[PDB]
Amino acid sequence: RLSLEAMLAERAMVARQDLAGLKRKLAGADRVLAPQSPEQCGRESAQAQARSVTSELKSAVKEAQGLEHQTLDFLEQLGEYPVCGILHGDHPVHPSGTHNNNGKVSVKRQFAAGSDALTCAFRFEDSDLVRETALKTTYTDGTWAGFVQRLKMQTTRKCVQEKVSRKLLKQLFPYDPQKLVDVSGELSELVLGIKTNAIASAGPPYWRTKRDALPDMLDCVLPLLYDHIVRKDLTTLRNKHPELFLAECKNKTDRYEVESLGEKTRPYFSHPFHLSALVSVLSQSFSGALKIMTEDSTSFNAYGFSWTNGGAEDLAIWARQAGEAGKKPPRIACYGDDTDIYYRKDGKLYRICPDFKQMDGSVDATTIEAVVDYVVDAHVKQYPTARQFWEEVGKLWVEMATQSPFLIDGTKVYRKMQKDGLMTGVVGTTLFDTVKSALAYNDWADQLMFGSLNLLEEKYAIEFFKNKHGLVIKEGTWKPALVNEDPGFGELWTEQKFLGLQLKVVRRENEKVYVPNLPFEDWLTMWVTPRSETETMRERTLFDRARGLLVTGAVFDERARGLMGAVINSTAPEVVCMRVQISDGYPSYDWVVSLYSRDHPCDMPRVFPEAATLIASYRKQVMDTRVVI
Amino acid sequence: RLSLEAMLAERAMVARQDLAGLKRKLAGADRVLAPQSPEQCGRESAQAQARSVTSELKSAVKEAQGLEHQTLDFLEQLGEYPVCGILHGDHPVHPSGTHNNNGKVSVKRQFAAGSDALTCAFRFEDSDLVRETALKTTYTDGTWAGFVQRLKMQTTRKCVQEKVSRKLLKQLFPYDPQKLVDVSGELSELVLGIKTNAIASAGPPYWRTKRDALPDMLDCVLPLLYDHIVRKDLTTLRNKHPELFLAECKNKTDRYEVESLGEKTRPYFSHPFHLSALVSVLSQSFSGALKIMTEDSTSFNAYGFSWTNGGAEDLAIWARQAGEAGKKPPRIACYGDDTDIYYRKDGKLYRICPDFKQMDGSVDATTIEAVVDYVVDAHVKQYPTARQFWEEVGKLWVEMATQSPFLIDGTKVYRKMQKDGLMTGVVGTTLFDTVKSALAYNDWADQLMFGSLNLLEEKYAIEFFKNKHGLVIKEGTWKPALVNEDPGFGELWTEQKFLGLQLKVVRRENEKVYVPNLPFEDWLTMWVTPRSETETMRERTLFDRARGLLVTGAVFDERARGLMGAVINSTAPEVVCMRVQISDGYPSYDWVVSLYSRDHPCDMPRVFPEAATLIASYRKQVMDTRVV
RNA sequence: AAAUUUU
RNA sequence: CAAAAUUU
RNA sequence: AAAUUUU
RNA sequence: CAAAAUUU
Ligand SMILES: [Mg+2]
Ligand SMILES: [Mg+2]
Ligand SMILES: [Mg+2]
């Protein structure tokens, strides 16, 4: 049946899954060890210290979770919605058990309290530093109090309608028309082309993951929706089946400061799959086309930027051609509220990296409608035949971004009082944020051309954004700094962070490679707060995260490189060469430097160079058949 | 992360493994039912009759398995061999537990006395006919007695050296030189190119399957063997490690007549992996090049022939251009001892389909050496740079086919006394048989050109092959028959079987398709004796075998088509659309006819046409974005 | 599967 | 993990 | 995985 | 199943 070559491939594939034999075969194998930091104490002592810290964190979190949460009076109320009765064959779309107290759609918000990574950290670095950094922040569900507080900040903020046109958006957000999907083709194929998180909630009315809910959305609800869209019949469908247009307001689990646990917890909105999917066609095509600022000088857009393969250097070469403030144009780039501003002053280059507080709450209805228009238009320009249909989708998109009815906890249904303010979680969220941001910063530069250079000062800039745009600058982020225009080996660009990373220069054979960087404390904080079950898979997760952080820029910090190296070298060979979804290479300093330089891509150095042959139990060995006998 | 199209494919692949949900999803689906025969009796009554037949067969088999087996005096004896001590890294090549009583290599022969196919048959066809056909034959390991008797027949037969040259073999077995492997390259790659049964025994000294034993052969034993081959040092390696050149004699499990259980049990020889692989390079390349008789008028070779895609018709058009016996050349084709002879007599076309008795025992040393030479030569002609090495492999091939030392049961080692007689199991077995056969039949035709037409008669032909070639014609197989040169719809070519099948013509659209056929009794015999455990997998096996038989030609017999249809239609939908190694189509009469006709290939009709969408839970439905 | 970033 | 961007 | 075929 | 040939 099979050939020997194929039989060997077939047996190699299975050997990487037989971890007992992999462990047996790789015992005592030559191993390329990573640069590593010495161990400070034993794994058992380290477990004890980790256990201790985890306990302190659990009790502080529980404390903050017991705080009273201010009422939800600031939201309009639409009573209770009935459970959707739509059936797809043998089963209902809305499952029988879930999200239904009786008749009415209900929802229960999750705030729970309460690490192998913290253990490792205690194993390889100074106890007191690990302790205080692991107590500064924590990955958690947040608190009811801070949830409601940030929700109020983002649903009730006094906004300022922006002054925007397609002319302006063409200027600030150039794209490449020929990279837009052909949006006139059948809807089914177009929807089948979009990408999505298979594990994410499909939202109402499916109340399961998207891979679970895909057929029910696809052959049942989406055709009904289409029927009613072209029949101009949407509001009677909204009446017959309210749950089809309902969202769920949810608390984002992530890294939070512990001291601020009762003030800060991000809210976001889960939308129905059939609506998000429909809009995603346009959204994702547009993301496909959008140029970034290193490609096109007029662009204010950094959404699509990459640090790797020259990106850092590109950012530098871009920035450093900014003009004298008041005379020539500055260099401004935005990714959401995360902005990077460069400007000159008596020839000398300066940089500012400001953030905005609850940026969603500052995004105005005019801006949202203008962006939806700009996208739909960008498509129907290239593909006129479908104009009407997608315009009818635009009307939906906007009502989804500004005025969706939504659940929070239990059966009550709410809605934002004003049209202004973005419902974070809607398709296009990041783009709306980026746009509003760039529009404001463009008005800023325009005011600089009219001699208002006192807008370069914290004092007046805060006023400007508050009064002219409704943007609240997270204080202390407007601190302009002198740029080291041409850094020497090991020197920073500035100490400021853009997209969470400092820019730095490193030596490579007398060349200067621009790379990301952070101080050790930051890398260690990221190490000890992973975002999330055999011993094996956990050991592998440790390995993977170490590699990841190294690649992100931890290899360019002394202490962090040592810690990640120690983790890697602890990893048992079976776990390194394991079949996972294998890569059994580690990132050396040199390889990562190559990753960020413009070099052609290439594979990581193998941890066990001769592992393939040791596993397969067979080298090739040249045997000449032309030999004389 | 993923796209919806891909997510749906991913979800479809897993739904075909969840048989509960598969059953649920297919509950009310349209089913393309196969042509079927009505039920003769209930499932429980049929179970009772099957149980009964199984009991009678078990006790007859046990009886025949207890018979005394005549001594092994007819074989040379070389005593006991020591267990090979070669190590490959951390473990020995010869595992610690197995095939070692102490110090010495030992082997234990398996004769066990051991049906729901029979159940199905009793359910859907006449009770008495099913009973007697299921008692005529049985799939079994055989008996010690018949094992030793046939071993004696194939190791001690008085042979007749054939009269052979490369000239003759070029004539009878033409090939296409440019389809031969470039055998001058590196050995590793060439050996990696050969195909093999991954589950088969690698034989001594590995004593495990070939996929288990592949690395040990590949990076350890094969280099040692090469070293000693080019160093001209083979016999001292044979001395240091005898088990490297040892074979295992084995009893073939298969379909046996119950009446003949103590007279007939096929022996064959499992050879070492490192030797078989090395020879396979040449053997398989040559098979790649070898022409067949429907390609080349001079060829006597039918090894490579296919019934499908016109093959049957090709056989007809070939045959019917045979000449008047004594004046012009006949048409003769061989596949092992299975031969097909066509000749004319006063213009009228005749056919003969004779077989030989234990043909391996009749295969002479001259023929084996000549074939090995012909193959090695065919290669080193095209690729001279590699001559010596492959010539040294030829010497091995020959000693492997004629004179291998071998085990049977226990520790004693034996060897064939004579060089004559082929050791079935060696690489190239079928080709050696085909050549010996064709050589004899060519001498037959040559005697026909010299006016000896009484060789067309059973009485003198049997003599001819016995005396001039050592070939013993299984009696009653030389019965020449008048060919229906141009058959009408539904008529046979002749009633004779070649490659186990009758030739027949069926109608399609006023056109005649040539197809294989067998009488019902034969299809039923094959049905009730399968060759080899959940409810699921057994229910699926019934389905698979029914499909298989239908495709082989059972769809062209009424009663057999009905039985296979009934089996297929019994198969629960979950089992049809199950993820297996899916195909969830059945072979309709029309599709099988297309298979044997010259039509372009195409897939079987789905049993459940709308099953894909029912499983995925989505049928595409065009919704146009250009609507007002 | 994993790392980082934004809302 | 609601939408997303970069990377292995 | 399955069917047929030769030794 | 020891070598194999044809086939899905
Ligand atoms: Mg912010
Ligand atoms: Mg025969
Ligand atoms: Mg015979």
Author numbering:
A (entry chain A): 12 to 125, 129 to 546, 552 to 600, 624 to 671
B (entry chain B): 12 to 125, 129 to 546, 552 to 600, 624 to 670
What does the paper say about this structure?
Thosea asigna virus (TaV) is a (+) ssRNA virus that infects the larvae of a defoliating moth (Setothosea asigna) and the prototypic member of the Permutotetraviridae family. In a previous work we have structurally and functionally characterized the non-canonical RdRP domain of TaV (TaVpol: residues 1-674 of the ORF1 product), showing close resemblances with flaviviral RdRPs. In these enzymes, motif C is located upstream of motif A forming a noncanonical C–A–B–D arrangement with a unique connectivity of the major structural elements of the active site. Here we report the X-ray structures of TaVpol captured in three replication-elongation states, revealing high resolution mechanistic details of different events in the nucleotide addition cycle for a non-canonical RdRP.
The incubation of Δ10-TaVpolΔ607-624/5′CAAAAUUU3′/UTP complex cocrystals with Mg2+ resulted in the hydrolysis of the triphosphate molecule, with the incorporation of UMP into the primer molecule in a pretranslocation state. In this state, the 2′-hydroxyl group appeared hydrogen bonded to side chains D447 (motif B) and T438 (motif B), which in turn was bonded to D374 (motif A). Two Mg2+ ions occupied the active site, coordinated by residues Asp369 (motif A), Asp351 (Motif C) and the pyrophosphate (PPi) byproduct. The PPi molecule was also salt bridged by K488 (motif D) and R280 (motif F) in the rNTP tunnel. The newly incorporated uracil (U+1) in this pretranslocation state established a Watson and Crick pair with the A+1 base of the template strand and provided the new 3′ end of the primer terminus. In this state, the conserved catalytic residues D351 (Motif C) and D369 (motif A) still remained coordinated with the two Mg2+ ions. The position B Mg2+ in turn coordinated the ppi byproduct in the rNTP channel. The conserved residues R280 (motif F) and K488 (motif D) were bound the ppi molecule, opposite to metal ions. Another difference between the elongation complexes of TaVpol compared to those of enteroviruses is that the active site closure takes place on RNA template-primer binding, before rNTP binding and is maintained during rNTP recognition but also immediately after nucleotide incorporation.
